[PDB]
């Protein structure tokens, strides 16, 4: 046991030295050679109303017009951004829903929560009524996040510190990702769907592969539980947000943080993070009844999106980057542009 | 300007909004309470008796008493980090806390169970989300405590205790010990009650506590309190 612990410590020191050897220059010194972005003004366009409970998850569709949002009332609503009309209303058996996902093709949707079971609902049913298609059970913890890898397979994250890839047609988990010491909180799929990063309460993130089913890499630097994680539009980097009131951008090739986003007046944790289409700007939802935009290259605050009446819970940018939706516990989802 | 399909979609959205409003008004019609306590604290017996009077994850029990519906949420099986999802129960009406009154000399793999129960009660009471959420303490092992105190002294658990070995003084001291843990007496109160073989008395006490709270909530909502 002692020899194994000494070997682990030696490997950790070697990894630290290797990560430090690559820190030839910081992102700030390189980005100081470009002019800063001007003041970004985003005015709320649509004010979606109809929810009577706290919002906890939302996801846009490939069409960049429909967005599915989940609330604690047990009702999943698919809103139309352009007309603010409800397309469907899925009544959940367990009102304690915390995560929701919208498949790429939009034929199926996934949801989960404290029930420890992921429910899949089909929207293109010939019967005409949205009915649960498959119930993926087996998780010993609450479902924190889930995203559609493909129309056939899906990946889910549970509070039991282990994720699982479930096949819809089969219904049994094929790959089990283990290694996290804390409860996994959020997921984010890469553009190629081959690798995915997951953050947990252990103040560290892990990049895993789909087919291999092993931890491809690990990233550290956070001081609290990582609440949100998002992939960079290019697929070579990813941002993470924890309760330490600061975001951290990591690169899958450098194996270390590039730049930190923080401000003295910000003392509360972060709930959601999402990049833009071009990645030039980053958005982060905070608990002070608003969201903040940061410069991904200079970390300068680009703007503040205020108007939410409660803790900001989720935010998402359209696939085309036209507008950005933000949902909070106040039961209202606002679109900004 | 809206075309035929647009007007039809708007009408369907209005119908969905009406259905959602009706569902919300119907659900606002049921009280919500959160059950907490150790597995051996008698929660199972309380749930069984309350169901008679009327797998991993969280359990949801529904029962009506005096034309009043209740939703008991049991999260005991959710052995995970509570501070990351307990906030979901911010709007809960009451917190039914069950503690093992007789399990004061046993050992658990704090070493003692009473200290752990007190710590959990203090953490749930002083929680930032339960500043106003009322708590109702239930002692589901009063008979075992009466049968054990005659042989095993209470000093083993509370060395500082020096009162008489009678059951009344010991019960009063144990009650005051949990009552003093409330650091928010100005905004919230605790309703303590001793459970026994009888079950209707506990249901009546829960109904009265829920009735008191609904009253205080309505008073604070209309602007009076």
């Amino acid at each position, epitope marked *: 046991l002692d020899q194994l612990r000494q070997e682990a410590e030696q490997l950790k020191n070697q990894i630290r030295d290797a990560r430090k050897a690559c820190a030839d220059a910081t992102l700030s010194q390189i980005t100081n050679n470009i002019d800063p972005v001007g003041r970004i003004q985003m005015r709320t366009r649509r004010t979606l109303r109809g929810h009577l409970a706290k919002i906890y998850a939302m996801h846009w569709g490939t069409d960049s017009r429909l967005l599915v949002s989940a609330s604690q009332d047990g009702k999943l609503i698919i809103w*139309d951004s352009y*007309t603010t009309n409800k397309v469907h209303a899925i009544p959940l058996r367990s009102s304690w829903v915390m995560t929701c996902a919208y498949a790429p093709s939009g034929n199926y949707v996934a949801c989960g929560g404290l029930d420890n079971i992921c429910s899949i609902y089909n929207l293109k049913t010939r*019967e005409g009524n949205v009915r649960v298609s498959r119930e993926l059970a087996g998780h010993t913890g609450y479902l924190s996040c889930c995203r559609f890898l493909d129309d056939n397979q899906i990946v889910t994250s549970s509070g039991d510190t282990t994720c699982a890839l479930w096949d819809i047609e089969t219904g049994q988990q094929t790959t089990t990702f283990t290694g996290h010491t804390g409860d996994v909180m959020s997921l984010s799929l890469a553009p190629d769907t081959r690798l995915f990063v997951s953050g947990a309460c252990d103040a560290s993130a892990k990049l895993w592969d789909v087919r291999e089913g092993m931890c491809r890499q690990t990233f550290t630097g956070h001081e609290s539980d990582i609440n949100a994680i998002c992939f960079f539009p290019n697929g070579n980097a990813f941002a993470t947000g924890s309760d330490d009131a600061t975001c951290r951008l990591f690169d899958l090739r450098a194996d270390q943080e590039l730049m930190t986003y923080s401000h003295d007046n910000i003392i509360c944790g972060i709930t959601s993070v999402s990049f833009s289409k071009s990645g030039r700007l980053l958005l982060a939802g905070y608990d002070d009844f608003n969201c903040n935009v940061w410069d991904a290259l200079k970390a300068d605050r680009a703007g503040v999106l205020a108007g939410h009446d409660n803790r900001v819970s989720c935010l998402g940018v359209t696939d085309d980057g036209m507008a950005v939706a933000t949902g909070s516990w106040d039961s209202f989802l606002k679109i900004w542009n | 300007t809206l*075309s*035929a*399909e647009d*007007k039809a979609a708007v*009408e*369907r959205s209005k*119908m969905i909004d009406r259905n959602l409003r009706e569902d919300g008004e119907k659900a606002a019609r049921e009280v919500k309470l959160l059950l907490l306590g150790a597995g051996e604290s008698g929660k199972n017996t309380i749930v069984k008796q309350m169901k008679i009077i009327h797998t991993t994850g969280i359990v949801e029990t529904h029962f009506t008493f005096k034309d009043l519906h209740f939703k008991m949420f049991d999260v005991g099986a959710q052995r995970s980090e509570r501070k990351k999802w307990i906030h979901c129960f911010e709007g809960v009406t009451a917190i039914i806390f069950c503690v093992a009154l007789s399990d004061y000399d046993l050992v658990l793999a704090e070493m003692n169970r009473m200290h752990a129960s007190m710590k959990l009660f203090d953490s749930i009471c002083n929680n930032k989300w339960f500043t106003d959420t009322s708590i109702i303490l239930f002692l589901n092992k009063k008979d075992l405590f009466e049968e054990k105190i005659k042989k095993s002294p209470l000093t083993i658990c509370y060395p500082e205790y020096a009162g008489s070995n009678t059951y009344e003084e010991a019960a009063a001291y144990i009650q005051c010990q949990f009552e003093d843990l409330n650091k928010r007496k100005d905004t919230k109160e605790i309703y303590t009650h001793f459970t026994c073989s009888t079950d209707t008395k506990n249901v009546q006490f829960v109904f009265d506590a829920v009735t008191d709270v609904i009253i205080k909530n309505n008073l604070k909502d209309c602007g009076l309190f």
Partner: single-chain antibody
Amino acid sequence: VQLVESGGGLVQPGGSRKLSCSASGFAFSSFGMHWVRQAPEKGLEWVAYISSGSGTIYYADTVKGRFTISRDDPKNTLFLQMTSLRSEDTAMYYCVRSIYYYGSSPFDFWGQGTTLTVSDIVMTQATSSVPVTPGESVSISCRSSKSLLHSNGNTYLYWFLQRPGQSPQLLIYRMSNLASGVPDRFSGSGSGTAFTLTISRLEAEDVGVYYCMQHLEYPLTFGAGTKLEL
């Protein structure tokens, strides 16, 4: 999904008939119902329509005020009271489903209909009969009096295929979306008022009549219909 109509037969002009369509196999409440007649050797024609929850009911000028369309969601039954009958009202009345939401394919299912005998944007198809052998591609052209392209950015056009002894089948909706279950051989395009339905390779199953429908204004007009037979 199945629709069975009842009521009809021989009816004198001064008589009245209550046609009843029993709906089953789908959410009847959420799906509105349209009535479309088809006289002998004549094209289709919209009769009346009921919206979800009976919130909006519409009738055609040819039947406005004379007929009464009602609905029963608890019982899941569509009712049509026909008070007065004219010498030209004899036609097979078909009940059609229609749900309205972003991405919906209304008029997808057509009922079998019932036979009853009694003792506006203009749509026109260039060709009526186009004899062609199987295997060769086919093209059916259509023209609308008014531009169906709405400011929202879509064209309200529908194509239906009615085979001998079978009810119409939705081929393409909104001029660019292929109906579910229809072979990919069918394609639709158009511009402003000139539309075209193309078939890569005709087959025996394609023998039948192709009808067009505009849905920009609720008064629906159907074309004569282009017939294709080997």
